[PDB]
Amino acid sequence: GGYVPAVVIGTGYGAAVSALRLGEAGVQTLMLEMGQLWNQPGPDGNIFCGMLNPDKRSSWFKNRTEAPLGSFLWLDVVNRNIDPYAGVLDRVNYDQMSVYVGRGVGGGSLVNGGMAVEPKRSYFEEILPRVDSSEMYDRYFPRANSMLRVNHIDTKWFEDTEWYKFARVSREQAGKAGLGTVFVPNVYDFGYMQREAAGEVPKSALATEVIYGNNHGKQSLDKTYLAAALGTGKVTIQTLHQVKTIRQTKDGGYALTVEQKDTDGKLLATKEISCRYLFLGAGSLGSTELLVRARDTGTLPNLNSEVGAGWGPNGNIMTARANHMWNPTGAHQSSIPALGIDAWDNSDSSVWAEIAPMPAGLETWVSLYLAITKNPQRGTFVYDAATDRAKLNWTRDQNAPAVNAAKALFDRINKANGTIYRYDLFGTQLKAFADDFCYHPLGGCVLGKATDDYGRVAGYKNLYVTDGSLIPGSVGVNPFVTITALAERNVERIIKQDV
Numbered sequence: 075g076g077y078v079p080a081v082v083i084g085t086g087y088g089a090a091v092s093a094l095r096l097g098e099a100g101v102q103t104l105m106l107e108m109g110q111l112w113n114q115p116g117p118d119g120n121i122f123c124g125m126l127n128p129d130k131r132s133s134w135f136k137n138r139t140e141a142p143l144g145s146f147l148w149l150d151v152v153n154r155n156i157d158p159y160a161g162v163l164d165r166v167n168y169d170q171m172s173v174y175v176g177r178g179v180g181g182g183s184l185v186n187g188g189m190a191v192e193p194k195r196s197y198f199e200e201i202l203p204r205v206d207s208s209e210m211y212d213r214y215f216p217r218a219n220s221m222l223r224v225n226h227i228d229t230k231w232f233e234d235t236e237w238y239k240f241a242r243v244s245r246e247q248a249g250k251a252g253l254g255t256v257f258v259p260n261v262y263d264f265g266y267m268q269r270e271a272a273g274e275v276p277k278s279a280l281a282t283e284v285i286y287g288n289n290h291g292k293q294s295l296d297k298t299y300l301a302a303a304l305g306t307g308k309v310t311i312q313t314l315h316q317v318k319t320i321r322q323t324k325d326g327g328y329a330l331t332v333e334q335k336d337t338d339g340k341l342l343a344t345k346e347i348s349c350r351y352l353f354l355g356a357g358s359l360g361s362t363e364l365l366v367r368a369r370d371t372g373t374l375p376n377l378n379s380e381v382g383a384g385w386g387p388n389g390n391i392m393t394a395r396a397n398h399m400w401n402p403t404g405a406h407q408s409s410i411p412a413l414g415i416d417a418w419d420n421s422d423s424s425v426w427a428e429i430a431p432m433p434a435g436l437e438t439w440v441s442l443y444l445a446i447t448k449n450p451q452r453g454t455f456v457y458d459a460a461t462d463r464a465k466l467n468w469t470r471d472q473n474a475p476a477v478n479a480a481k482a483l484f485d486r487i488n489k490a491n492g493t494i495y496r497y498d499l500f501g502t503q504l505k506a507f508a509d510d511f512c513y514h515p516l517g518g519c520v521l522g523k524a525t526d527d528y529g530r531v532a533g534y535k536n537l538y539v540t541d542g543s544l545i546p547g548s549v550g551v552n553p554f555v556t557i558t559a560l561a562e563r564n565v566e567r568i569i570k571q572d573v
């Protein structure tokens with residue numbers, strides 16, 4: 075423990091942008107990450123386990139592996155009991171919602187599908203009217219794409235390869251309903267993916283890896299922003315260090331209590347770390363819990379009532395259609411999506427749907443979709459002092475508008491093609507729409523509500539939030555490009571005016 079000029083909590087998108095720019099500005103910066111640095115070959119010689127061979131590396135402190143959502147019917151057979159371990163993917167269970175987040179250096183960039191998508195400017199303008207959309211679209215979004223290593227699939231290869239048959243089938247089906255598809259830019263190197271298919275390089279996307287990490291191809295933040303931040307000479311990263319409490323010191327600045335653990339979860343030390351500038355990049359869940367805890371235990375008593383509010387799951391809904399026998403989706407499906415259905419017009423019927431691959435590795439005729447919808451419902455994180463946890467006050471009926479929007483779009487597709495939903499992919503009960511999970515948690519510390527328009531926490535100086543907690547519950551697309559671009563805007567301004 076001791077003093078560092080700047081501390082960044084977490085190592086996801088908001089954190090990584092912040093630390094790079096701080097380091098470039100000459101500010102010595104310590105990043106504290108509760109998960110691991112994923113660079114140690116494991117028992118199979120790989121850093122990460124695949125989706126057909128999950129082991130303790132797959133899961134943050136659970137005692138059994140779980141099938142990727144949509145896949146239980148085919149992948150429960152590979153599940154096994156495991157030791158609780160500092161694995162890469164954390165299913166965080168709240169009363170009526172399960173939020174999936176990455177744990178490690180790089181955060182959700184380790185486990186996500188790589189999809190780098192800019193929101194519709196008119197929707198950005200609706201959700202954040204206090205922000206200048208011009209600089210976002212002409213400066214920050216381009217900067218983020220370049221630093222993230224966003225790239226584009228070759229359309230000829232896409233059209234030919236067996237690995238994207240699943241995507242072409244849904245494109246054809248959607249077309250019969252008058253719905254168009256879009257190619258989705260990615261941080262997975264598509265050139266690498268071609269060479270995987272050709273047998274020239276080790277497979278990752280083409281070997282059923284994504285949600286527990288990619289051993290190859292995916293340019294997660296440890297390779298992009300965080301590598302650059304380390305390269306400044308002004309940034310260091312301490313792992314298996316979880317920030318528990320934040321206080322304003324009597325002499326200025328912030329002090330943190332930080333627990334260091336081993337990979338089995340044993341407590342090794344509790345350290346006090348202080349700083350001048352404190353940046354929260356612990357995610358929608360993590361940053362919001364730190365601040366509700368600090369307000370409600372009296373260590374940051376001047377936090378406002380908007381801390382904790384305004385959470386939403388980005389309208390996330392999963393659903394699946396049963397194809398006709400003559401439309402097999404293939405046994406070989408790249409684990410990186412390449413196409414979406416863009417039916418998003420900012421109205422309440424809007425849907426942006428990823429055409430999602432399935433990992434079963436045999437023909438199932440199923441088409442899987444992750445829908446992103448416009449649902450005004452929000453939840454609130456409240457502090458439970460008894461257990462020292464933020465609890466998310468969301469109820470499953472709050473996803474009814476999301477279900478309704480997703481169903482209306484997929485009903486069109488089913489009507490045009492004479493197909494039906496699958497009802498058995500998410501559990502025993504007939505359920506065509508998974509409505510109590512989230513991959514894209516947004517809000518809790520909303521920009522302009524809990525913070526100023528650059529993420530400065532209201533009530534405090536030199537205290538910043540940088541991450542998905544800033545976004546008001548919805549962006550209409552996969553969120554990380556927006557988190558990244560918004561973090562570029564925010565840290566630039568903070569450094570210029572405050573540092």
Ligand SMILES: Cc1cc2nc3c(=O)[nH]c(=O)nc-3n(C[C@H](O)[C@H](O)[C@H](O)COP(=O)(O)OP(=O)(O)OC[C@H]3O[C@@H](n4cnc5c(N)ncnc54)[C@H](O)[C@@H]3O)c2cc1C
Nearest residue numbers: 084086087088108181182187188189317360542552553554
């Ligand atoms: C299965 C899945 C698929 C997804 N697919 C996509 C996709 O293709 N495209 C897209 O745009 N988005 C996708 N997402 C969402 C995207 O990954 C997240 O929106 C993004 O990672 C959020 O960034 P963040 O900076 O807010 O936080 P995170 O990336 O979640 O990072 C927070 C970091 O802080 C650490 N941390 C938390 N609390 C503490 C603490 N108290 N002390 C220390 N460290 C702490 C965490 O361990 C983590 O490393 C996906 C996510 C999942 C789970």
